[PDB]
Symmetry: D2
Subunit: 300 residues, 4 copies
């Protein structure tokens, strides 16, 4: 079709890697994280960076805080990587870029990964970490509001934790910033089948990541299963034109607005899955990320 | 929105009937059946009509056979109605039209209806009746081949029974003719969100029908949950442009072809859910039904 | 995307020929017509085939009449080829198949080709040949009705000649059977941009053909520029899912139904431009052509 | 699934019915007064200055907004179908663009149809860009100049860039295109699917097209252009439920095929006019803020 030519390389890198559903998952995570750290740019400079230990019930997560503006308010960032890879180090240039462009604190959280830890572990990490930080604000130097954000699998966690906050009548995030979340048990929508091969994220990789994270349709795994979208936090949704996960995301925006939740959704023309973390590689993608980061503070 | 103007009365009738999820199951069935009985045109004349009792393990189904052409072969037809409504009487004019246009025997089978009978009752009715007639083909005067067909819920039964025949390595139908089946657990595709209000079948009614059929994602309820599409019978798939159920159906026919199963799919431009049984009100619809019925005999 | 895998060979062969837009038209015509004759399959047997000279004012056209059924009625068929190529011989296997499946006379007419003969020559050939045969019907053994049909550029001629019959209040054809016509001045619709390079009918070639046919708003060149679709003949419209020409065609069907003209439109799922004349290599395409051909006699 | 914020505007537009028989000066009057009547509170801006741009054979009004003592500028061509709109009815919106972008916004009043048919507005846009590019110091401009517009004004912005490139003249720094009309379209899928019920109708499109044309030229319709290379970096914003959407998404794909820097976003649930509806739709407001906040990076 008309995918942005900036992606030509990645769409090659993808094809010539061949099939990977057959190599050990721990082996696979390692390779992918190493790739991501490779041809990367100068990290934008951030005034203060601080490392944290989020001591939860029965597990401790690493969190890195990025702050360029002695910011009052924060976003908790949950990285993508299909619930299998990504970590603070591979997301470091991107979270820096987010912090610089938003001028708010960005707290990048390492939830537990599949297949060692299956659902609901990473979900419970996101929900518990939000509430940990929401109670321990001062430790993180947060004087204002806290929202949540993520990309891909991490944006699934961000959306899901907000549903749980709403369901339990708990403290709510101020905003949910969702860069192309997985949301639904989808092997059949039109975006899924049309873009199910060759656009970096494949139909086969979706099923494989799905098999690794799940044991054996709950709303905290798949938010589009929820019965009610009212009283969720204001949302920013970013979708990609050529991405199997596109259609369910655009439905989610529409459901939020129907429920009277404040929500802006934009589809990036010519973009693919992973666009946001491709900000150093695609100027269109970089401008989409800059657009979102620059309005984030208005919600905090 | 460019829906065929022949549907305008039906769409209005449907909006002015109010919120149907509101009314109790058996009451709604009766009202929907009586609504279709009124819309009825003059029945097409058929040379031989015969009534049968299909005597299955623990229940007996009515079946009616229409034969305008002393035909060697037959199609078993499972009526639509969301698993809640429809019967031989409401389908009689349409089944006569199919028999006249195809020149083959059409056997319309009354399966058991939800909510009184939930999954897998209708499903087992479809699969058992296929095998009953296949085993007893001389009782129906069938000397050639037997295929299966349906519309909406009935085409779900047709596609699902073919999956079970394949899985069990049993006798297979010769062809599966699917008019707009339900196939997937879908509350999120683009067709579902875009067309879930003003097009006769609503998103709300889809959810009501689904909760009535189900107990409590397995392939005989939702064929799109299947692992494997190889070795299924040749298929004819008809979708409608303005129908929330459309995108999964188009995916289904692409997954059949991907597996090497012979399949032809057509989307009816400007058509809505129910178009085939609306053959007396829309000439567009009538010609789509005629197109399909006239190629059936080539598979038999 | 999910193009039916039956077309993978044609897509590859189209890629292998490279960019033919700097080829001189007469050389390209030779290449494409001779390529087609060299690689075609076994022809279907037809009871009677007869060649005619259509003696119009100022020029004589070749016509071949195919009749498997001593039929009373006829379709005048105008072949495709971008206005530049194709002829009776390259269409002969396909015209035979239409005759066998429809049971009516098919008269394949050789209109004048561009750039040697620019618009309005082919159009005048199409309109004048319809009126010539309609006046002289008894000479061709036609006792019943006459419709018109074509594919691609030939379906443009069929749709355009109907518009001029309507405008002039002359005898109108009984039906217009349009397989994926060119209809509009389009280098910008979504089907055009999404599907215009995957090799078979490209954007660059669509331009090359239009520039060869135009001398430099005329509804008889582009029917979508007509301001009125009333009182046109009943239409059958076939479009292909993965074809740059698709979206204007699907708009044309809708415009016809908005003006109250009988029309049925079907989009072939997984099909590409040229699908009908590909009937020997794709069973899905073959079944779409059979569907259409078998309802043609109802209009005559 | 149109954003519920537009429910009212869609209803009001349905109510009005087909206004083809209203004299074009009266339709202009009514639509302009309707815009003024529904203004919210204006955003305060540090400096606003009025100018006359004396061109060959006509003078244009222009209004400069500057909230940030800025060095660079965007020339803004309002929308209105080539028939209506003016500096006053665009004043709340150009104030918001100037507040959110922190660069100078200079809103230019080009000549309107049908009194002034193509190529008058087009010449006004191209000539006023070159006038101010040649005379930058007279406007307090020390840096760069880009061009922008919505709907018909975004057509003028796109078309003037094509002429700059064709004449190898000075080029704007960036072209910021809010849902321009670009092509002779009465047949795309967005055109036919969103031709009624979405405020801008297929009948209005033909009507404005007929008022502008003296009755396939690329400075009328940029999608007719031969070649898209060497055009200014672009930001393209389209609306999901708008008959003009598909050609616009084609244009962004063509710019990128030509190696022009471009970023294109489709606003989910949005309709034609979404940017100038920033006072009534928060999603629309957030789209305009997204775009305005990136503008300074090109200047």
């Amino acid at each position: 079709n008309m995918v942005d030519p900036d992606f030509n390389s990645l769409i090659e890198l993808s094809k010539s890697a061949g099939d990977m559903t057959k190599i050990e998952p721990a082996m696979l995570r390692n390779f992918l994280d190493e790739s991501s750290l490779s041809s990367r740019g100068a990290p934008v400079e951030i005034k203060e960076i601080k490392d944290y230990k989020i001591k939860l019930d029965g597990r401790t997560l690493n969190a890195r805080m990025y702050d360029d503006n002695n910011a009052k308010s924060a976003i908790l960032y949950y990285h993508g990587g299909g619930f299998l890879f990504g970590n603070i180090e591979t997301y470091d240039n991107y979270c820096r870029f987010l912090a610089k462009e938003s001028g708010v604190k960005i707290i990048s959280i390492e939830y537990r990964l599949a297949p060692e830890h299956k659902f609901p572990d990473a979900f419970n990490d996101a929900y518990d970490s939000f509430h940990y930080i929401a109670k321990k604000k001062k430790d993180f130097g947060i004087e204002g509001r806290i929202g949540v954000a993520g990309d891909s699998a991490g944006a699934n966690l961000a959306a899901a934790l907000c549903l749980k906050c709403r369901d339990g009548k708990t403290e709510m995030p101020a905003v949910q910033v969702l860069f192309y979340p997985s949301l639904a048990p989808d092997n059949f929508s039109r975006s899924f089948i049309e873009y199910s091969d060759n656009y970096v994220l494949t139909g086969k990789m979706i099923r494989y990541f799905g098999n690794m994270y799940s044991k054996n349709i709950n709303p905290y795994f798949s938010p589009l299963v929820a019965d009610d979208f009212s009283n969720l936090p204001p949302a920013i949704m970013v979708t990609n034109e050529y991405d199997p996960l596109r259609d369910p995301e655009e439905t989610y925006v529409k459901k939020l607005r129907e429920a009277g939740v404040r929500a802006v959704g934009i589809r990036g023309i010519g973009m693919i899955h992973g666009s946001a973390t491709d900000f150093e590689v695609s100027d269109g993608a970089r401008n989409i990320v800059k657009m979102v980061a620059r309005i984030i503070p208005d919600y905090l």
